[PDB]
Amino acid sequence: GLSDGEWQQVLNVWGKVEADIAGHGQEVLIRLFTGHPETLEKFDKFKHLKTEAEMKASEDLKKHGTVVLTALGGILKKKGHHEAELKPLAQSHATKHKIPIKYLEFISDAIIHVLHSKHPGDFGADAQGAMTKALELFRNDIAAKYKELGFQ
Numbered sequence: 001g002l003s004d005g006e007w008q009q010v011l012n013v014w015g016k017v018e019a020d021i022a023g024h025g026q027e028v029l030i031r032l033f034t035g036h037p038e039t040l041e042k043f044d045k046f047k048h049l050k051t052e053a054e055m056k057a058s059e060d061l062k063k064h065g066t067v068v069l070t071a072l073g074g075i076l077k078k079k080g081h082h083e084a085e086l087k088p089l090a091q092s093h094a095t096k097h098k099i100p101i102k103y104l105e106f107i108s109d110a111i112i113h114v115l116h117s118k119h120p121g122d123f124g125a126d127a128q129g130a131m132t133k134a135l136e137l138f139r140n141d142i143a144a145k146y147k148e149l150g151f152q
Ligand code: HEM
Pocket: 039, 040, 042, 043, 044, 045, 067, 068, 069, 071, 072, 088, 089, 092, 093, 097, 099, 103, 104, 107
């Protein structure tokens, strides 16, 4: 897992996200949808968005971005002791939303990209390393739940 120092880095970086959750959430989803169009198809409520301009102007997309990052933030603050918070998320995304683990890899990468884009020069090598480890832990624990369900 992560060391105490690494978790402190993760939560310090997260402070940046919390200053503008909607903005970060919106950019993460737009990065995901524009870089991997197949992901948009998983959202019946966002498949009407044919352009990035429409995505940017969508208040409902910003709303979902807030829901997504608020959930992730709650998980991150548990510093790995997130079974109760993560299990239900893993099961809903596998059985209900049908989200391949590959898409979770895509959104993890999108988060790192957005952090650099919104905070250039202020997301250090150590910070990136820590956030990456936290996102991999998140993804890997979801993957374990996916295997349990036999979900691909
Ligand atoms: C940072 C990783 C993610 C987090 C924390 C997250 C969190 C959530 C939460 C809290 C909800 C609402 C509750 C629920 O249905 O469980 C939700 C809904 C949903 N998520 Fe995710 N999600 C993540 C990644 C993804 C990815 C990668 C996809 C597909 C590309 C996806 C697709 C969906 C869909 C389709 C819904 C239902 C939306 C609706 O129509 O209301 N999620 N997600």
